Design a protein around this ligand. Sequence first.
Ligand SMILES: CCCCCCCCCCCC[N+](C)(C)[O-]
Ligand SMILES: CCCCCCCCCCCC[N+](C)(C)[O-]
Ligand SMILES: CCCCCCCCCCCC[N+](C)(C)[O-]
Ligand SMILES: CCCCCCCCCCCC[N+](C)(C)[O-]
Ligand SMILES: [K+]
Ligand SMILES: [K+]
Ligand SMILES: [K+]
Ligand SMILES: [K+]
Ligand SMILES: [K+]
Lengths: 222, 226, 225, 222
Amino acid sequence: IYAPLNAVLAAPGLLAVAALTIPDMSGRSRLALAALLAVIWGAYLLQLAATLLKRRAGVVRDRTPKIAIDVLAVLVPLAAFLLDGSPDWSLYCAVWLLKPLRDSTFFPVLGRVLANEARNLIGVTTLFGVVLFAVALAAYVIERDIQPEKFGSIPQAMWWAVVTLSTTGYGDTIPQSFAGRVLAGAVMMSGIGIFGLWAGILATGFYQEVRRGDFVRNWQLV
Amino acid sequence: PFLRIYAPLNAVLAAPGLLAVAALTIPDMSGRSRLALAALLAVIWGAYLLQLAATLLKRRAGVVRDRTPKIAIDVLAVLVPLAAFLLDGSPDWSLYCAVWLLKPLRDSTFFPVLGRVLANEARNLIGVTTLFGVVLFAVALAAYVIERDIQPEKFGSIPQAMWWAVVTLSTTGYGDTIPQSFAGRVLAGAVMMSGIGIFGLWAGILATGFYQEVRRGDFVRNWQLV
Amino acid sequence: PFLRIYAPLNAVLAAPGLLAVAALTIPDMSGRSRLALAALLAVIWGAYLLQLAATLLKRRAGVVRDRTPKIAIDVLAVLVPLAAFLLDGSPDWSLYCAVWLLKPLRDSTFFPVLGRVLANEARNLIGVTTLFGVVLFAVALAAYVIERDIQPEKFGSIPQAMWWAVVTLSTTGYGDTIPQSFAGRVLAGAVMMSGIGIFGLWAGILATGFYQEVRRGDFVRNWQL
Amino acid sequence: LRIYAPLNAVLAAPGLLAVAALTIPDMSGRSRLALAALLAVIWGAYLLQLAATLLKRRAGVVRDRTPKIAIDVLAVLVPLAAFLLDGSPDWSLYCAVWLLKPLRDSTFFPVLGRVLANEARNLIGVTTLFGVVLFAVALAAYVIERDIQPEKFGSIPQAMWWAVVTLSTTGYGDTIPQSFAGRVLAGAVMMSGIGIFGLWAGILATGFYQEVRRGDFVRNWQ
Ligand SMILES: CCCCCCCCCCCC[N+](C)(C)[O-]
Ligand SMILES: CCCCCCCCCCCC[N+](C)(C)[O-]
Ligand SMILES: CCCCCCCCCCCC[N+](C)(C)[O-]
Ligand SMILES: CCCCCCCCCCCC[N+](C)(C)[O-]
Ligand SMILES: [K+]
Ligand SMILES: [K+]
Ligand SMILES: [K+]
Ligand SMILES: [K+]
Ligand SMILES: [K+]
């Protein structure tokens, strides 16, 4: 109740956005949730004024990202109220998803962790892509004839690929062949490998963040 | 040899205790078994009562040690199930014996270690959670807009799209809500890749947390080694 | 795979062995194949009989050494499959040849390292395991009370919720049991979220465990060079 | 911008999409031809790429460029062979050799090589552990579930199908143990899965960490 200011306001606000999309809402509740949005919207309008008009920070600073979150929090929901006539106007209040990211740290840290690992992270992604395509290609050739409706194309087998490789596994597409299921099992295993490859990179990324502070204060110790 | 001999004493009693709770929830339990499982609970409740006195009657052991988390579990382990026995009349009373879940926790170590790992990395850990929540909603919002019309039974509301989103993003995928349209399936794929991304984030923070835990012992090792 | 043909000689034989055990369980196998697969088992078992005699008879290798686990695997590999062959009349005898699952573990350099990594983390690893059990049960208890009346056959007891709990918490999730009410599904999401939390803990502990093995790899750096 | 400057990786994207596009049933005659023409242009592009990497030798005195040559050679020859040999519509599937093209002119992969090489003994050991456990669990589930479910657990290879599905934590739902004894096993298999995930993650984390130790030795020299 001391630090989470804007993030707390976003909580019922974004829940209210979700509440309006529920079918069979009574006129009372339909308006009550809309009124809830208005109050939360009106709360951010004070917040926008509190940042713009009050100008006691220092001499040299950068506030471009922070103001942008406050600006979009009041303009987009207002533009929806004015321009959009359909009930789908309240979906535009989703811009309040930027609000919890505003006053939270870690995101400047994640920025430089992802920056120091961008070279390696993009590499894992394209590896995932290459593996996905190949894994789908094999599953297509093996299965296309038995299941023309499920494995009839590379895209169709690609659906099975991302589902199986990421180890999500819905169950709507399953290889029926022995040769297919042996491939399937190998996709699942190599999935576990990719899981750990993301974890390996990021753990080395977060380590080198602390290592930067340890060699930063270590060189400062002299 | 050492980890399975030091901790399993006070914590051991919770195992048959918590299984006895789970046993009394099964329908068609014969009176013989019904009473025997209740009798088992009472014995373990009795066993924990002597454990309560052991921490209360013992006044001297060293100089200064904290026993607030240790005694609190010992108190709750005998207070709750007895209060439920007398105040609640329905057979649901023994569900309060689930308080013994705290018994194996602060009986061994690791958890005090886990505490300071979770404390020194709380900034990042809470940040990942809020990233999960934000990505969860945005993804669900998209899934709703894409597939509310085609297949109205699912994805017909943000809540329903959020139900799919958690199932998909956590890479759980029950398979009760699966997008039909190509546009929604590409999104679904993007959710599953970013799912592994979050898995790597949790594993990334905690790997750095437990690493600092050991290197914090070096600050105690550099001061006085031999 | 080019240099690992004549390197794990004792482990390579286990591959066709274990796959034969799997083949003899497939229903409606032809009489010839049934006999041929059983013949393959006896040749591999025969091969281990030479392997046992090679390690038992020959003993001239150094002065100070310890090979208790290595002999333990080889002794079982010839005694157990033979005992079943003689004593078991049912076709299930060939299942006992799964003893050769220990054979790949015999010549691996990895498992000596994994053993001491698990030994260095035993305190933490059992801690994460009990944390899984506690969270499992607590979540099951919650899922039980919520879904009792709505879903009688699928959430009617704690064990039924426990089944859902491991299915959900480990993030397996077949789809056989799912909370139906809003209340239960909010919990469900939190169980899945804590799944990712537990996953990261196991990875965190073990990553620290293998990091400390590099710390242990300062024996040749501080003493030799 | 910088990595997306060489067309090697960029041209592969619409190339591989074109391979996937032709597998789709009920396509328009226009697109069917158009997508093939796109593959021919991309093929000709890689031919020009092949010529540059074969004729230029002025850069440096003595080094190695074997993998890049191998990828450029395979990117033109494999499709060319399919152009000449394959008469069926399956000819365009051989353009999936351009899966080596994103890997070609990109870093991380020289790192991923030595990271796998540094933990080579460890990584295979996890895989063989996975196999042993996979079998042991499948053998167990077979004996417990074979009578009640002959269609699902009637043989070891059938239980092995479940074992990968379950242990890799994919878990479709086409095979689920019924008996209490079988279900307690199932839960225990799911648990041990989380540990194997962590093992892969642990090994690879230690692999990438040791590469950073070498980066400290590389910063010590230069
Ligand atoms: C590399 C290990 C993963 C492969 C294991 C998968 C088992 C293959 C499934 C065989 C089942 C036989 N069939 C046709 C009845 O399904
Ligand atoms: C950016 C991640 C890529 C995910 C790839 C997923 C491809 C899904 C396409 C499946 C086609 C769907 N359907 C029903 C038309 O066949
Ligand atoms: C190691 C944790 C695994 C524990 C999960 C086992 C769940 C118990 C199975 C309950 C289902 C029994 N039955 C037949 C009543 O449904
Ligand atoms: C970790 C928090 C995320 C949990 C999200 C769970 C969404 C539950 C809403 C599903 C809709 C329920 N119902 C019955 C109305 O369909
Ligand atoms: K999973
Ligand atoms: K699943
Ligand atoms: K399913
Ligand atoms: K499923
Ligand atoms: K899954």
